[PDB]
Amino acid sequence: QKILENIRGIGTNTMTIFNGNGFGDRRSRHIQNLKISDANTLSKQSYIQSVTPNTSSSGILVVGNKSFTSANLYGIGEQYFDVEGLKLKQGRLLTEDDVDQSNQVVVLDESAKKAIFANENPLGKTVIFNKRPFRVIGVVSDQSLNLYSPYSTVLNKITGGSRIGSITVKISDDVNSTVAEKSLTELLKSLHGKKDFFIMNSDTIKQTIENTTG
């Protein structure tokens, strides 16, 4: 019943593509070869329902007179909250317009809201990440100071470049997960010119459990 009754809902119709060769290789994970253009091409495959780019940075967040360290700002796609199962609790989520206009808006984690705002109303208030002001537009349920902003805003204004840490894809409901992984792998290899990424999904978890000593 281990694999059974468990992988339920984790990486079933979603796959996350990461830089490098695996978690058993932190080194290769630092090299960023995934690009927004990769994500654009993926968004166009017929077997792909949505694509969410993901980059992040950990820095100093000022709120009013308070200063916090190791606040994580994620630059993610519009579909991020849905695919990760984060429930909107208050205000609003990112829109296509936020992404398109690279708006400095942020969506707070439940525990981030509590840590930074306690019982205060967070909506409409400004938080400053590494000197850059963002307006709080909403709050979601959590997965340690997580803030979510459009990937475009974070790339354009914070990290620079068009390279990212990972891409989560939502697979078409009516396609064979194994076939989708293969097409996705072949396309990205073609794009990058080499296999310098790895894919995490239900199959990966299962394959890990099978190959561990019990």
From Swiss-Prot:
It is found in: Cell inner membrane. Residues 1-214 are periplasmic. It comes from the Bacteria. Disulfide bonds: none annotated. Disruption phenotype: Mutation does not produce a noticeable phenotype or alter the drug resistance profile and the hemolytic activity of A.actinomycetemcomitans. Belongs to the ABC transporter superfamily. Macrolide exporter (TC 3.A.1.122) family. Homodimer. Part of the tripartite efflux system MacAB-TdeA, which is composed of an inner membrane transporter, MacB, a periplasmic membrane fusion protein, MacA, and an outer membrane component, TdeA. The complex forms a large protein conduit and can translocate molecules across both the inner and outer membranes. Interacts with MacA. Part of the tripartite efflux system MacAB-TdeA. MacB is a non-canonical ABC transporter that contains transmembrane domains (TMD), which form a pore in the inner membrane, and an ATP-binding domain (NBD), which is responsible for energy generation. Confers resistance against macrolides. This is Macrolide export ATP-binding/permease protein MacB. It comes from Aggregatibacter actinomycetemcomitans (Actinobacillus actinomycetemcomitans). The lineage of its organism: Bacteria, Pseudomonadati, Pseudomonadota, Gammaproteobacteria, Pasteurellales.
